């Protein structure tokens, strides 16, 4: 003799020892990224090609 069993309810596991099907469908995906940058240029110049006489002292 087994216990009371419902009629219209689905067959769910209810006690220790009942079986149940697992459908393994796992799909995980993670990601990350980053960056950084910096820059600097400089260029100076000056040239007195032909100096007049009254400025030759400087």
């Amino acid at each position: 003799n087994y216990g009371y069993q419902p009629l219209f309810e689905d067959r769910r596991p209810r006690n220790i020892g009942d079986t149940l099907t697992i459908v393994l469908q796992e799909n995980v995906s993670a990601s990350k990224s980053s960056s950084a940058n910096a820059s600097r240029d400089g260029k100076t110049s000056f040239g007195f090609d032909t100096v007049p006489r009254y400025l030759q002292g400087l």
Partner: protein, 50 residues
């Protein structure tokens, strides 16, 4: 021949016979007189105690 189960899914009676439909009236439902025979008995505690 049809077995009649309880709520514990055990056979308590066996049913077989001719159906009597009224013949508005219901056509998809009938009743059979003395159509089942008891096969299992239930225990009881009648007669025990005061």
């Amino acid at each position: 021949m049809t077995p009649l189960k309880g709520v514990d899914s055990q056979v308590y009676a066996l049913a077989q016979g001719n159906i009597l439909v009224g013949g508005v009236n219901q056509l998809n439902g009938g009743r059979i007189t003395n159509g089942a025979i008891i096969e299992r008995e239930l225990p009881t505690q009648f007669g025990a105690g005061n």
